[PDB]
Amino acid sequence: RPVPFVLSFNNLTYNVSVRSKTKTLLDNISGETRDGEILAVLGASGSGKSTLIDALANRIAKGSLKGTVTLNGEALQSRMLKVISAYVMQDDLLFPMLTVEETLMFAAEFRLPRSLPKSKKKLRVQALIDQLGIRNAAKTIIGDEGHRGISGGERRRVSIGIDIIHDPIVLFLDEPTSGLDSTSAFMVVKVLKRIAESGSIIIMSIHQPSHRVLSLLDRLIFLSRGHTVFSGSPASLPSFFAGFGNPIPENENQTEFALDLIRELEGSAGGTRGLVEFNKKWQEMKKQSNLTLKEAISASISRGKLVLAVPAFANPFWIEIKTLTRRSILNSRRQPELLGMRLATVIVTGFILATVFWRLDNSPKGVQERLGFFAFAMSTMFYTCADALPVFLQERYIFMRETAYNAYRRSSYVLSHAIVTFPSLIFLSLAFAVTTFWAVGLEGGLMGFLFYCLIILASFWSGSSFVTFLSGVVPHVMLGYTIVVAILAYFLLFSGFFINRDRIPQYWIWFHYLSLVKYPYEAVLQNEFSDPTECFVRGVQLFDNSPLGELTYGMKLRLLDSVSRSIGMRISSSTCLTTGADVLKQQGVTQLSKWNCLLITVGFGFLFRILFYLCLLLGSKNKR
Amino acid sequence: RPVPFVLSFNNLTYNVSVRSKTKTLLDNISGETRDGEILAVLGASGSGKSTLIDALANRIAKGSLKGTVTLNGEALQSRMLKVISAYVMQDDLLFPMLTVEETLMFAAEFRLPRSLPKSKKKLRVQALIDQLGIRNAAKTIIGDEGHRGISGGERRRVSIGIDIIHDPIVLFLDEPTSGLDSTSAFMVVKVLKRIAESGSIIIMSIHQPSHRVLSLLDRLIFLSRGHTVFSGSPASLPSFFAGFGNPIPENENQTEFALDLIRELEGSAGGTRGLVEFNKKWQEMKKQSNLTLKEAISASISRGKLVLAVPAFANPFWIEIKTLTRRSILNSRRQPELLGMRLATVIVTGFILATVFWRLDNSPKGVQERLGFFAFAMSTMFYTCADALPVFLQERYIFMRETAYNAYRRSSYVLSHAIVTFPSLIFLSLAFAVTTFWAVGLEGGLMGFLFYCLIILASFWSGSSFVTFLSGVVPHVMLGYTIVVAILAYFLLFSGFFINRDRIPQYWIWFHYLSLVKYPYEAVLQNEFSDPTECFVRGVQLFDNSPLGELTYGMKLRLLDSVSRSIGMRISSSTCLTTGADVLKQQGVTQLSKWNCLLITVGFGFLFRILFYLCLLLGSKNKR
């Protein structure tokens, strides 16, 4: 009554390069399994059980793996396998600050469709907690090395529950009963047998199965250093080894006797090669005793598996954005000191600059104070944004595992990550603008304050987007901080406030127009000097910091009369020598309006999110 | 013939706070074990087996744990347990880029003394690889999620081999046979039984022991939600449960039947409390049927355990510095792109500044170019040093595990970390100095170049030491980058090149003298302007960037005669108006010599290494 599926794999061969020689990890491994059955992979530690499951689960790179994997006779595509399969790896990889039932509820919201209501998604998480036996750990965090949460065997069954909350057609489990006691290992294999007999293909590895667990496994494959040495039912184990020449006693464990003989054969002079040839003869000796695949999968969705076209994702992208946003918010509530310290250093930076640059005046040094305040404020904004570099990098391995089997789109991840960080950028922009606008004494009134909040927000948005893009380009957090800090220094050097645009060499002026700091710095200057007739050098301040010494006030008026004699222009003591428009001409802030400078800063932020998404399309897979 | 040891623990009680209610993780757990025996801890997943071993291994915090742990009747001190014991945790935590035999050789060099030669340390690693059964994985890296190395069961026995290469008196193993096949689990317990019968106390947890493994265990303790439900020999297990009321059949597994009944009792109305009271009665019926501890430990060292005073560390601190330096060098050879990209961004920063600030001249703008070059060069040096923040943070959990049982002193770690990073700081200082000294055209000749290399090196040394100190203060890499970037900005703001020392407010001048950038920036300025009569403003450059417009050359001489009329001083066209000594007076670089400025920069680096060491003395323990 379930839809029949036959997963077949033939001649699987995998080689790695010793780093320059070659080592064969899988050697000509064939086998098959049907729905309704559990195929168990056995063998010693290091025999290739994780490699054989990595080959079948589209986890080793194309071109590296030889041989063919089919489903119902037709080639099992990598695009189809992400839709219908799930993989519980040998190691657990969970978000540490979420609890057990929060973790299983996020995976239920990723993998179950909108046709199932939220009350019935919660009933499936509660029923999965009860039958996996982790009720006592349900409100406990996962934890990590620094934070104690659940036990190791409890973390194991959370990883099983992440991938069995929906009902996939193919299920790969790398050692699901490792770290489990004998009665909870039996509970897990009874759960996996129920999923099997509902119409699934189960392929699992297992190390020390008891006679209770081994009776639930329908097919066994024994590995020995990448070779198959046994394939068949558990009941055919005494009949196999009696034909090989080493019969099993009735009082000993049959899998314990098998791996004892196999390890002894590994140390022999002739190897396991006599057993490998004998197993090939044993498989050839037992061969002497309509609906296409996309239709059979769609007929299986109609029966209840993977809860008619086959959608690659269970939910629309906006349902996935809503789920990914709530998990990022929940990871931020559990570590409140991350946003709390980012808010604290921005407020302290604003308070320090408020006391240092207190109520700047219309003077020649009040201009250089304004230019140096805005250069410092814009520069620490972009350097603050470098703390966003480990955000993707500590999520990246979990992101690779979840997107390998279509829990959410990678576009939904980029959209959700840009949405969750934006309320904190608003709080940092408001905290910096209210501590510095009225205390430094910036111009514009209320509309000048409003533009000031907007261009700080665009700076944080542009800077975070660029640091996010470089986090998707580098693999390493230390490589990334070396590169971000260097490029942010080059954005500062060619911004226009270290050296002017007229002094930048011609072969560097392309990088001046790609400076991320240039356009918000040019926007706060036009917001500050927005009165084109406001006087900044009244004409006795012509000799403020000239290389003549310090001069008396009456003799500075002697020079004002004397320099009037030689240039023609009459400079009295109240003649304005530099207006707000003159400051913007000397700094070179003349090309764009402050609104176009704000628009370019917003547009750089959108460009780098798209480039980060394109880097998630080309890279960030964890193959082999 | 081995020295007798009796480890006894009584009334162990541990409570955690649900985060506000309280949960009892260990409840009145007593028991004892002797040398020559293996005490096995059994129970379901989540019953407290890791917590019971964490209590005995001095791993949960003092005050949190109640009850007493003794050794030969005397209280097992935390200072003595670090010397005589070792702990294999449930999770593996190894350096991923080292191979298997490199990892075991570093642990042999940490734990075996100088009286054992290096040839005999290598023979003990080769013999440990053979009897743990990991010969095939010996030249393979450990790996991590991103880099495929050894298998999971191979990584397990590396973690066992790290703590059994020396022969400790007490050995705690949290699930050593998890992830292991049945024949290599038997090989590990036979190795642990050999260590036991040479005079060690073995306390291990185990989940699914076969009848082969269970015959090697002398004492069992069964846990059920923090309570002891069984203590005794494996042979007394059918006699125990026949007296409780549920006898065991002779054809079933005795530990499988026990945990089946215990889990059924957990779901009953009355709980396991009848079994917990029955086990207390069962222990009381079996009570009816000279050399002090420091002398007994010293008599055990002379027998060969922990290969007469008892040294807290196997090696002198300079042997530990030599071992820790080689492991850091080996981790850097395996990731050459870390140093390669740090060298590349420094060379590129030096090349960019060489083309931008090419061969600066004696002009008023050539002074501001020199001041802005040196401000930029010193600032990117300290911001480059922020990439040292994850160096301790990705090593910290391994550092906590190794120093918890005295593999090396924490002082040796601080000394080795300051020694390994110093050759790379020399290469970065030489790369920046040769790309910028001759191209920007700095003064001094060869001795000015030599001081220039020294003050860049002192800047890198001072900046790295401070970022290292802040890495020991924060727990998080994102918290640390938020704090380092903010404080490096405050060092820049109060350095003296954004605003002068005369313009810094009086309530901030204490922080100006604590600015790390101030003293190397003041040292390169006195190296540059080291000729006190070198002319930078000749007397036609008095009106270079004055607010008068651009002026013809003949009419600037009209002003020079006109400004000579009003001040008395005759300023001709060749009259020097600003010397190199005048530039240093205007910038405020007058207090210290450039050699004392270099000495303070070196001294700040030594201060922050000491403060990082003091933070490793007070914190960086991973308790509970």
Ligand SMILES: Nc1ncnc2c1ncn2[C@@H]1O[C@H](COP(=O)(O)OP(=O)(O)O)[C@@H](O)[C@H]1O
């Ligand atoms: N990328 C690799 N490079 C070098 N050796 C490898 C690599 N992957 C695996 N080996 C080896 O292949 C063998 C089998 O790998 P694995 O599948 O993880 O074993 P297991 O049977 O425990 O699952 C191991 O000895 C392992 O060290």
Ligand SMILES: Nc1ncnc2c1ncn2[C@@H]1O[C@H](COP(=O)(O)OP(=O)(O)O)[C@@H](O)[C@H]1O
């Ligand atoms: N710090 C903790 N906070 C809350 N619950 C905890 C904490 N530590 C353990 N628990 C719980 O104590 C129980 C036993 O812990 P553990 O010793 O790790 O179990 P195991 O028997 O598998 O070794 C687990 O259910 C675990 O979730």
Ligand code: BEF
């Ligand atoms: F779940 Be515990 F590690 F037995």
Ligand code: BEF
């Ligand atoms: F060592 Be493998 F994980 F069996």
Ligand SMILES: [Mg+2]
């Ligand atoms: Mg494996």
Ligand SMILES: [Mg+2]
């Ligand atoms: Mg545990």
